[PDB]
Enzyme design. Structure first.
Site, PDB file in Angstrom:
ATOM      1  N   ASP A   1     -12.578  -1.661   5.869  1.00 41.44           N
ATOM      2  CA  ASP A   1     -11.309  -2.093   6.453  1.00 41.44           C
ATOM      3  C   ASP A   1     -11.436  -2.610   7.881  1.00 41.44           C
ATOM      4  OD1 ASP A   1      -8.645  -2.579   6.941  1.00 41.44           O
ATOM      5  OD2 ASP A   1      -8.063  -0.460   7.064  1.00 41.44           O
TER       6      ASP A   1
ATOM      7  N   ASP B   1      -8.552  -9.394   8.389  1.00 42.33           N
ATOM      8  CA  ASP B   1      -8.336  -8.046   7.834  1.00 42.33           C
ATOM      9  C   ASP B   1      -8.793  -7.886   6.384  1.00 42.33           C
ATOM     10  OD1 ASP B   1      -7.517  -5.435   7.350  1.00 42.33           O
ATOM     11  OD2 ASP B   1      -5.365  -5.882   7.386  1.00 42.33           O
TER      12      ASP B   1
HETATM   13  C1  LIG Z   1      -2.969  -3.351   6.367  1.00 41.96           C
HETATM   14  N1  LIG Z   1      -3.846  -2.206   6.098  1.00 41.96           N
HETATM   15  C2  LIG Z   1      -3.446  -1.004   5.596  1.00 41.96           C
HETATM   16  O1  LIG Z   1      -2.297  -0.674   5.278  1.00 41.96           O
HETATM   17  C3  LIG Z   1      -4.690  -0.096   5.476  1.00 41.96           C
HETATM   18  N2  LIG Z   1      -5.718  -1.003   5.974  1.00 41.96           N
HETATM   19  C4  LIG Z   1      -5.188  -2.130   6.300  1.00 41.96           C
HETATM   20  N3  LIG Z   1      -5.865  -3.203   6.830  1.00 41.96           N
HETATM   21  C5  LIG Z   1      -4.844   0.312   4.006  1.00 41.96           C
HETATM   22  C6  LIG Z   1      -5.139  -0.670   3.029  1.00 41.96           C
HETATM   23  C7  LIG Z   1      -5.271  -0.328   1.658  1.00 41.96           C
HETATM   24  C8  LIG Z   1      -5.534  -1.353   0.710  1.00 41.96           C
HETATM   25  C9  LIG Z   1      -4.659  -1.477  -0.403  1.00 41.96           C
HETATM   26  C10 LIG Z   1      -4.905  -2.515  -1.340  1.00 41.96           C
HETATM   27  C11 LIG Z   1      -5.988  -3.406  -1.120  1.00 41.96           C
HETATM   28  N4  LIG Z   1      -6.806  -3.297  -0.051  1.00 41.96           N
HETATM   29  C12 LIG Z   1      -6.585  -2.302   0.839  1.00 41.96           C
HETATM   30  F1  LIG Z   1      -7.438  -2.242   1.878  1.00 41.96           F
HETATM   31  C13 LIG Z   1      -5.079   1.024   1.257  1.00 41.96           C
HETATM   32  C14 LIG Z   1      -4.778   2.007   2.233  1.00 41.96           C
HETATM   33  C15 LIG Z   1      -4.655   1.661   3.602  1.00 41.96           C
HETATM   34  O2  LIG Z   1      -4.366   2.650   4.524  1.00 41.96           O
HETATM   35  C16 LIG Z   1      -3.856   2.285   5.803  1.00 41.96           C
HETATM   36  C17 LIG Z   1      -3.918   3.497   6.759  1.00 41.96           C
HETATM   37  C18 LIG Z   1      -3.478   3.069   8.181  1.00 41.96           C
HETATM   38  C19 LIG Z   1      -4.285   1.847   8.669  1.00 41.96           C
HETATM   39  O3  LIG Z   1      -4.249   0.779   7.714  1.00 41.96           O
HETATM   40  C20 LIG Z   1      -4.680   1.127   6.399  1.00 41.96           C
END
Ligand SMILES: CN1C(=O)[C@]2(N=C1N)c1cc(-c3cccnc3F)ccc1O[C@H]1CCCO[C@@H]12
Ligand code: NI
Length: 393
Positions: A34, A223
């Protein structure tokens, strides 16, 4: 970096993950890659969607930091206990580091049924770590504790189960077999998210002609943790209008343009040529230069296999509205080999050796484009008293 090639896996729309180990002896977990967050956090208690989790008690090298962490986000949260332990990437560099690990003990709408990952690897900067910027992110620890160069690169390659995806995360270098043609760099505007500046947008070679600050309102970021290309409201509306016009021979329901409904064609008959290319011009390393990255409908129309009609190719529209700026998610990244050159505060793009295309068009990275007296396309986020009050020692 042959041993690091092909080290990413996942299910379409559910994020790309890398195998990591935590603790002594090593416990293997699949970890979401991520670039839009900054915490290393792993399931550490039972959950309906986890087959396994980090067992702190099984690790001789685990240390409790005696501090909790709470991480709310849009329609979700994870929380748990901070600690440190030994961490490695089996199909990465041949090194082991002591990193901060958030042991997730409670969560809501965080884990995804069937995604096959049990944790998250936040590769962005300390500024956006929780609880605060004093919690050293994983990559910072890796660089500080080893001789690994301060750079990583990502090649994301896009009836009853979702489509499998693969890719590569090369840590500490650039693997030339993963791209063709020129590698073009855009500055990291600020080290928090991987923030960049878009100077121009075209849809089928036609300029959207907006004030370029609109493209970066209130930021533009790269991202891997977002599936879609996400665009600020005004930009999204102009793009959808242009894409609708180009594809006008077909009349899709409103649900399709909202990403709420699939559209289908008989297997192998998808009219790719009625859908336009999308070009984002990114600020160059040189003041008045830019380069463009161009993606195809093969990137922004996501394949979803339908049980009810298995003889059809069905697609979700993967460009969506944002109120938090541009997000160059998996839709963008799947076209390209993306170099996160932290050492030189820049992000590189080159045509990916694995991108999906046809015999007529290809995803492209092209430049330079020079503009006489380039405007500043960056947006300055209004300063809150909250943010202003923070001391930074
Ligand atoms: C926007 N964003 C999130 O909401 C986040 N990571 C990012 N970049 C994220 C993305 C996905 C996810 C779901 C589906 C497909 N790909 C993915 F990576 C799943 C969980 C997740 O948890 C969040 C926790 C707080 C920080 O951001 C995190
Ligand atoms: Ni002070």
């Amino acid at each position: 970096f042959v041993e690091m090639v092909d080290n990413l896996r996942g299910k379409s729309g559910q994020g790309y993950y890398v195998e990591m180990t935590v603790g002594s002896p090593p416990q293997t977990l699949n970890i979401l890659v991520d670039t839009g967050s900054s915490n290393f956090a792993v399931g550490a208690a039972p959950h309906p969607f986890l087959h396994r989790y980090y067992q702190r008690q099984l690790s001789s090298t685990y240390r409790d930091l005696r501090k909790g962490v709470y991480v709310p986000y849009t329609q979700g949260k994870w929380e748990g206990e901070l600690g440190t332990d030994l961490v490695s990437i089996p199909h990465g560099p041949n090194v082991t580091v002591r990193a901060n690990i958030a042991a997730i003990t409670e969560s809501d709408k965080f884990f995804i049924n069937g995604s096959n990952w049990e944790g998250i690897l936040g590769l962005a900067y300390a500024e956006i770590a929780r609880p605060d910027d004093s919690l050293e992110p994983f990559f910072d620890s890796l660089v500080k504790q080893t001789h690994v160069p301060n750079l990583f690169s990502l090649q994301l390659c896009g009836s009853e189960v979702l489509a499998s995806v693969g890719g590569s995360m090369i840590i500490g270098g650039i693997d030339h077999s993963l791209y063709t043609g020129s590698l073009w760099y855009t500055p990291i505007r600020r080290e928090w998210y991987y923030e960049v500046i878009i100077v121009r947008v075209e849809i089928n070679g036609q300029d959207l002609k907006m004030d370029c600050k609109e493209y970066n309102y209130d930021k533009s970021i790269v991202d891997s943790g977002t599936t879609n290309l996400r665009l600020p409201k005004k930009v999204f509306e102009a793009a959808v209008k242009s894409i609708k016009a180009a594809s006008s021979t077909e009349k899709f329901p409103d649900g399709f343009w909202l990403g709420e409904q699939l559209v289908c064609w008989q297997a192998g008959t998808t009219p790719w040529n009625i859908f336009p290319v999308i070009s984002l011009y990114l600020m160059g390393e040189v003041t008045n230069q830019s380069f463009r990255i161009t993606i195809l409908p093969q990137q922004y129309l996501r394949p979803v296999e339908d049980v009810a009609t298995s003889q059809d190719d069905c697609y979700k529209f993967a460009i969506s509205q944002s109120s938090t700026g541009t997000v160059m998610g998996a839709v963008i990244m799947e076209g390209f080999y993306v170099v996160f050159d932290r050492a030189r505060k820049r992000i590189g793009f080159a045509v990916s050796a694995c991108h999906v295309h046809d015999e007529f068009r290809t995803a492209a990275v092209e430049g330079p484009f020079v503009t006489l007296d380039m405007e500043d396309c960056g947006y300055n986020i209004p300063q809150t008293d909250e943010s202003r009050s923070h001391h930074h020692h």
